[PDB]
Write a protein that binds this DNA or RNA. Structure first.
Lengths: 30, 151, 100, 205, 262
RNA sequence: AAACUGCGAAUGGCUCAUUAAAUCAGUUAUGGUUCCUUUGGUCGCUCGUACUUGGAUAACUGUGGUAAUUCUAGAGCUAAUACAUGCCGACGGGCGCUGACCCCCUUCGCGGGGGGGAUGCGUGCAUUUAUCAGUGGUGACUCUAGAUAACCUCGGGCCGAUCGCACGCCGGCGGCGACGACCCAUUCGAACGUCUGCCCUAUCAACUUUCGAUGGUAGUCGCCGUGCCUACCAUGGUGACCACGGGUGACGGGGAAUCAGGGUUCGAUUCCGGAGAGGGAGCCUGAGAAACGGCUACCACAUCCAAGGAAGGCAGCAGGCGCGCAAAUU
């Protein structure tokens, strides 16, 4: 369960950080 | 001046000062970083605290105290202690039977940082509540406003 | 072996007390001659010293080495006994059983 | 039965205070742990909440850190040479927090020579016992020898530290509370702190 | 004085239990648990005073020791178990699920829910913190520690918790325009849309909430519990929809209902 | 049944003696602490007999002592979720430092640049010290998390040798529970602080400071902040806005009686908070007591004694005595 939860959160964190980086680049676009 | 006026070495615990030196990086003095923090509630760190040499563990900006709770005010009436000043808080107490007021006051012993030079009797001080600093001191001076008569 | 006894007033005989008379000791849990009623209780109790003298109601003796003649009411009988070992390791030790 | 209560004290005005309750268990104090230098003797104390304090009564070993070189070593505590609070605490050689001690330097000397050729003092003298010249010269491949050669750049020990290393004893400050945690841990004195404490120790005599 | 207290006087009990004054000297002292002493409904009060399946506390004990009652999907045999806001009380023997919810008078109403809505609950996260080798943990109002929450979830947000697994299904951010209920103070039990949160650094933030009938009120930030995204609640509401009525309006409604009923 | 173990016995009940910014009330704080229990989480994250370890001791049997107690002693057995000890496996590794060795570029001399790797040493889920960098958070950390070098208490810190129900197919797995241990989350509190508010008295006007009084530095102790205490230093701190002292048939408050308005008086008394258990003081145990239906002394009073000793604490419920104008059923 620990390994499964760590993997799930790693994928979720990667997705969330990609979304945050996209928002940051769109903000620096303006 | 010389901050080592005690029987123990005075230093900020956060700052590591005897890091390994470099001959080319030596320019007459070893250089000393200053530990300072901003207390909250929109109070600015005095230029003295950021660029001073004094050691005061009860200073709100360079010491180990936190400002939580009541923010109070008072006028400085005594400055005869070491880093501590006696301020007078004046108020009016309402007596209901007579529908009137009486002038009351109480004296608060508050810690005064060396970062506040040129504090005078009659100056107004904004103090912040911290943990007990001594038997009677529970407030730390956060701001000093000069009396109008100063010149 | 001298295993203890009771003095003329019934007070028990305590091992570490090196007197001939009676003393008062603050006995606690783990001490002889005391039984704590509640956890942490200690009581001042009178105990007779461990040295044998004339002023004793009874002295307890344990035969650690038998002689050549059997005492008529002490050594010719035997206890038929019950309550052998209860722990499995003790049972296998008593009968010299292998772990298999 | 010693107590740390505030209600036995006088008022800020100076008047006497009449107690409304007797001594409480939570207001208790305990006898000071006058930790002496000797073979390790530590008595455990059951404290409020069921936790434990380690009342160290005798200590001769402490984990002291050479901070300029980031080298923390377990070392023998030799002496107590300065106490800021009480001079009695130096006569009795009591280990307390912030007390100045003389500790051994041999493990620091080993780490010293493992980064070979730290500042040259007396290394050409009529001495050199066998079996430790290898830690100074060794048979090293060109890459490892070049690594030591570039380590030679940062071979700078203060003169006061060099004299202490020659003496075999380093001045150090105990940053732990021996009577509360059971350890006498601290750091090697160096820099303006070392100069200040050397001046204080000399002026005490 | 020495050590914790174990009793609770009948008149010193929380007033929202609607206990009597002549039915004994003592009130059920709620056990330690997920909810506070004064913000909980002990299981005995729910099973005896509200649902009336029991006439005495002994009958409550008899009911509970048959393992007939589950709080948040777990069988509880403690008749003084503190059940509080958003808890699901399931009785499979009689086949009914309730959610402990607040009424506009500030009292835990007997709110029946469907078996499908008994599978989840809403929890306000009380804190978020990184610990134990970098794992983010989130603590909720019911003391439920959840590891690896969504990084967007912050304090004062609401999370939908699947009761079987105890894991986050979805979340509502604390934001203006989101539906919320008041869980403390004078406005306890009222439901409305957040309009403005005015911050007081070093002090308590105050949140303004507008009713679905246009009425506006204010509470402290700790007393807000986000109920839904926008104005649609994620959970079913009581007979009243969080709209507190004035005494005049309530009297008129009562008179009209009695006129039209009997 | 007993007895060992575990938990509780620190709640409740009584009383109002002490107590005058003290208690208490409202208000805030612990970013300055402790926390049994409940709840949620962590609980192969250690890289070097386990198919179950050891010794006792109760209960029980038997022998006793004392005038006397919920006094116990001697002897013969026997258990554990008591006490103590302790392992396979996860376990394959990986990480950092140390680098016995191996190439290319190349003024093939005179140097510097990149990858694999074995002798070896520490890893961790906690503690102590030093240093470094800057996952999440706050109004604000010297917070949380991370990295490094070490440490890791004989009075030693966790990493289950525990217990019931139900079914199965080749030398293996497993579904529900109970109990226990560590850490985190403050559920329940407790302890300390902030602000403001307390009756009469000047026939109490100056008080505190030797023996801490106010503050500073370092420490000790403590659960922590703190003159709490210690050493040194400074000479401070309070006061007609009434300090300090004294008095109170003074526990504080919610509240009660009276009251046109304003007020006056009462509040021992069932709820909240405090205090105490004859008076003082000191402790054990425990998460929590300076506990008294716990212990240890002294002081006062008092019980049994075979005079050697033993045993006390109704301001718990009844009930006596005494006191009184004054208050009920063993």
């Amino acid at each position: 369960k620990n390994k499964e939860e760590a993997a799930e959160y790693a994928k979720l964190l990667a997705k969330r950080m990609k979304e945050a980086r996209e928002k940051r680049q769109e903000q620096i676009a303006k | 001046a010389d901050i080592q006026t005690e029987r123990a070495y005075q230093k900020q615990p956060t700052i590591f000062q005897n890091k390994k030196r470099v001959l080319l990086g030596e320019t007459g003095k070893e250089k000393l970083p200053r530990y300072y923090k901003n207390i909250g509630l929109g109070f600015k760190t005095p230029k003295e605290a950021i660029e001073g040499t004094y050691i005061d563990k009860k200073c709100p900006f360079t010491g180990n105290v936190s400002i939580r709770g009541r923010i109070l005010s008072g006028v400085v009436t005594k400055m005869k202690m070491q880093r501590t000043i006696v301020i007078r808080r004046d108020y009016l107490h309402y007596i209901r039977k007579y529908n009137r007021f009486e002038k009351r006051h109480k004296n608060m012993s508050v810690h005064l940082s060396p970062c506040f030079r040129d504090v005078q009797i009659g100056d107004i001080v904004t103090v912040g509540e911290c943990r007990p600093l001594s038997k009677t001191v529970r407030f730390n001076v956060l701001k000093v406003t000069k009396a109008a008569g100063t010149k | 072996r001298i295993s203890g006894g009771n003095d003329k007033q019934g007070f028990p005989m305590k091992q570490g007390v090196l007197t001939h008379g009676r003393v008062r000791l603050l006995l606690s849990k783990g001490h002889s001659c005391y039984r704590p009623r509640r956890t942490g209780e200690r009581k001042r109790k009178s105990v007779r010293g461990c040295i044998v003298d004339a002023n004793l109601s009874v002295l307890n003796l344990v035969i650690v080495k038998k002689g050549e003649k059997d005492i008529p009411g002490l050594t010719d009988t035997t206890v038929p006994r019950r309550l052998g070992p209860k722990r499995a390791s003790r049972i296998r030790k008593l009968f010299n059983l292998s772990k298999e | 039965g010693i107590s740390r209560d505030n209600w036995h004290k006088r008022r800020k005005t100076g008047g006497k205070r009449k107690p409304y309750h007797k001594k409480r268990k939570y207001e208790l104090g305990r006898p000071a742990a006058n930790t002496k230098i000797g073979p390790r003797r530590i008595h455990t104390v059951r404290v409020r909440g069921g936790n434990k304090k380690y009342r160290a009564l005798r200590l001769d070993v402490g984990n002291f850190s050479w901070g300029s070189e980031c080298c923390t070593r377990k070392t023998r505590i030799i002496d107590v040479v300065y106490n800021a609070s009480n001079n009695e605490l130096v006569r009795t050689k009591t280990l307390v927090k912030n007390c100045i001690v003389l500790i051994d330097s041999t493990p620091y000397r080993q780490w010293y020579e493992s980064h070979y050729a730290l500042p040259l003092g007396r290394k050409k003298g009529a001495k050199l016992t066998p079996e430790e010249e290898e830690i100074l010269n060794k048979k090293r491949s060109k890459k490892i020898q070049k690594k030591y050669d570039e380590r030679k750049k940062n071979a700078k020990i203060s003169s006061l530290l060099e004299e202490q290393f020659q003496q075999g004893k380093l001045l150090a400050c105990i940053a732990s509370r021996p009577g509360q945690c059971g350890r006498a841990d601290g750091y090697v004195l160096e820099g303006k702190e070392l100069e200040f404490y050397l001046r204080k120790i000399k002026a005490r005599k | 004085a020495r050590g914790p207290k174990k009793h609770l006087k009948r008149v010193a009990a929380p007033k929202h239990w609607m206990l009597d004054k002549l039915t004994g000297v003592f009130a059920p002292r709620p056990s330690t648990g997920p909810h506070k002493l004064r913000e909980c409904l002990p299981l005995i009060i729910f099973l005896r005073n509200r649902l009336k399946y029991a006439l005495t506390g002994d009958e409550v004990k008899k009911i509970c020791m048959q393992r007939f009652i589950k709080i948040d999907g777990k069988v509880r045999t403690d008749i003084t178990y503190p059940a509080g806001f958003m808890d699901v009380i399931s009785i499979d023997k009689t086949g009914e699920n309730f959610r402990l919810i607040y009424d506009t008078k500030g009292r835990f109403a007997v709110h029946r829910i469907t078996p499908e809505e008994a599978k989840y609950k809403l929890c306000k996260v009380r804190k978020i913190f990184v610990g134990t080798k970098g794992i983010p943990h989130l603590v909720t109002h019911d003391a439920r520690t959840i590891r690896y929450p969504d990084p967007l979830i912050k304090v004062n947000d609401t999370i939908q918790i699947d009761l079987e697994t105890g894991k986050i299904t979805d979340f509502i951010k604390f934001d203006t325009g989101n539906l919320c209920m008041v869980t403390g103070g004078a406005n306890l039990g009222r439901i409305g849309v957040i309009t403005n949160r005015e911050r007081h650094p070093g002090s308590f933030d105050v949140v303004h909430v507008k009713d679905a009938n246009g009425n506006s009120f204010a509470t402290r930030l700790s007393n807000i519990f986000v109920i839904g995204k926008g104005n649609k609640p994620w959970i079913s509401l009581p007979r009243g929809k969080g709209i507190r009525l004035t005494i005049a309006e309530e009297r008129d409604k009562r008179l009209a209902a009695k006129q039209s009923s009997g």
